[PDB]
Ligand binder design. Sequence first.
Ligand SMILES: Nc1ncnc2c1ncn2[C@H]1C[C@H](O)[C@@H](COP(=O)(O)OP(=O)(O)OP(=O)(O)O)O1
Ligand SMILES: [Mn+2]
Ligand SMILES: [Mn+2]
Length: 430
Amino acid sequence: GPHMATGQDRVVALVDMDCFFVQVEQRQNPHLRNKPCAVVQYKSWKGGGIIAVSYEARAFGVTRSMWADDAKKLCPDLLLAQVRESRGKANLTKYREASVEVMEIMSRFAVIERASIDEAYVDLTSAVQERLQKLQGQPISADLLPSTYIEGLPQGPTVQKEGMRKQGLFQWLDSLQIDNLTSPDLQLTVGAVIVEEMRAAIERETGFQCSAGISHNKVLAKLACGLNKPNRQTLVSHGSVPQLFSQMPIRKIRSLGGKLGASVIEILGIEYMGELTQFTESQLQSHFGEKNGSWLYAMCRGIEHDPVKPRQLPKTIGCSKNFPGKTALATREQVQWWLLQLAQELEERLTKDRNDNDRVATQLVVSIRVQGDKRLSSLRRCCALTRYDAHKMSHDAFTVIKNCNTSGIQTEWSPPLTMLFLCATKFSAS
DNA sequence: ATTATGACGCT
DNA sequence: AGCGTCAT
Ligand SMILES: Nc1ncnc2c1ncn2[C@H]1C[C@H](O)[C@@H](COP(=O)(O)OP(=O)(O)OP(=O)(O)O)O1
Ligand SMILES: [Mn+2]
Ligand SMILES: [Mn+2]
């Protein structure tokens, strides 16, 4: 009853760019705008691999991970933009720099947690409190929420999507008690007003559109974000959770998309997030461990406490390349040349990072994969990163891996390497 | 031959 | 530390 926490203490948003790498390429090249188009890396093997798809192209069935030649079978007029290649490898710098553009705009409104190259969480609790005093018990006009969906509405007592959106929004606003400065629903609404403003700023100042979710925690905010994409934002209230979760596959919730989620389904014989409410906390802890069990018990009730961490910059800087099938590295000279290529891109990014962000990495992590293994990584070894010098870093990387070579022969490498990875970690201020 | 990343958990 | 999981 009165002592039962409801996880309504915070206002959290998740802002996620719409078909991000595609929009970066469409800003650069106007011919690609408002077209079925995708971003591809490499070209020689089956037209290259698709890593981003415009909403026009999705309508034809084009998806991420599809080969471009296969995508063209679904969409013959599909337009393609290629990822830049430097030192023999895909180079994602243009998209990292576009990410920074967006992150710096978001940071003007609130402290953000960078969650990926194209999304960040926002803790809006304080900003909401401030806007609420500005408002002075003034009602929130629908005009302040021109792209917002209220999940679960309209309900009860109609043909257009925008018409439905506004119907739901009006039901929501009509019910709001604006007199209470601590009503969670009011706080979420004001949160949504601020995110409309954030999203307008991102679009005005970069040309990029995005979607967003507004709720009381990160997991619900992310789920909300995807409910109405592209170019829209969705408010998921605490009250909307039982209906929303009653038909929500468990795999849809962040962190449950893999083996744990499959185990929840198999062991408990359920399909939907809401079905978890029928287990005790101890029951869930018995199956899934103390931490997961407690997390699941609260999460299926819409409650989660993971903070929006104040971190805008990535914690690691890495450079990775696969060498699939017959391209696998089988000579020492091969392995050394590619370590140098990776090390050279790493040095470039590290040096820029040091100038921009007043920090220095102190540890170099080296990872490889060997033909036959189908783990992502076969071996991970660390060494000291004492200077930003590609020749030194690549020599050091070779040193820490060179005894993986089963070859009795100096010059040959066996088994061949199907992946190399250099990652700079453990930053210190400088 | 679903690539290039990047965060966090376990022991 | 080195490995595994989950993510975009
Ligand atoms: N598995 C991947 N491999 C390589 N790059 C990826 C992968 N997933 C995502 N990316 C890149 C390209 C994406 O444009 C960008 C953002 O990813 P994501 O938010 O999942 O989709 P998206 O922004 O392209 O479309 P949308 O978010 O509108 O569905 O990150
Ligand atoms: Mn996105
Ligand atoms: Mn994303």
